[PDB]
Amino acid sequence: SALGKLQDVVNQNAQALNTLVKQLSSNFGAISSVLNDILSRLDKVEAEV
Amino acid sequence: SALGKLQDVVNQNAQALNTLVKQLSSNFGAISSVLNDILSRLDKVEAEV
Amino acid sequence: IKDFGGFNFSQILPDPSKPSKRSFIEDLLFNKVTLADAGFIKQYGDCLGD
Ligand SMILES: *[C@@H]1O[C@H](CO)[C@@H](O)[C@H](O)[C@H]1NC(C)=O
Q1: DSSP state of C20
Q2: Which candidate in A14, A19, B43, C4 could, as Cys together with C9 as Cys, close a disulfide (CB 3.0–4.6 Å)?
Q3: Cβ distance C12 to B9 under 8 Å?
Q4: For residue C48, what is the enclosing H or E element?
């Protein structure tokens, strides 16, 4: 019984970690896109000035 | 046999988590450097204008 | 900015073709119900006396 409970806990933790990794990758892609757009706007403003 | 398999799974998960933490720290340092450079450029542009 | 795609957390038994091994451990049924003797334990012992 204890081994089954521990296995279920480990499986739940693994699923949670997979979801966390997916959400982290999505958020990092979004942040990278935002930073690229910010750098482009900065370069444009500097050139215009 | 089940205990050995579970121990191997836990060790693999721990190694993966360590690698994830290292990569996360590296990416956060990179993002912090990018944000610092962006803030410096913003201050410079504001002062120049 | 490296992507987090190489992190594959493995499970124990996600879907191993649904084995469903029936153990059915009958350890409680392994009791020794020993039979009694041929008597002369309470009847003869009380009938003989001294
Ligand atoms: C992890 O590996 C298993 C088999 O090794 C595969 O079925 C699964 O799709 C992989 N998951 C990810 C997120 O790469």
Answers
A1: -
A2: A14
A3: yes
A4: helix C43-48
Q: How many CB pairs under 8 A join B and C?
A: 23
Instruction: Give me ligand 1 centre to Cα C8, in Å.
Output: 6
Q: Could you give the residue ranges of the DSSP H alpha helices within chain B?
A: 2-48
Q: Separation of A18 CA from ligand 1 center, angstroms?
A: 11
Task: Transcribe chain A into DSSP letters.
Answer: -HHHHHHHHHHHHHHHHHHHHHHHHHHHHHHHHHHHHHHHHHHHHHHH-
For residue C1, the chain B residue with the least C-alpha distance is: B27
The number of beta carbons lying within 10 Å of the beta carbon of residue C9 is: 20
Closest CA to A13 of B6, B26, C43: B6
CA A16 – CA B11 distance, rounded (Å): 17
- The structure was resolved to a resolution in Å of 3.5
Interface with A, mutate which of B38, B44, B48 (most A CBs under 10 A): B38
Q: Which residues of chain C are within 8 Å of residue A17 when distances are taken between CB atoms?
A: 7, 9
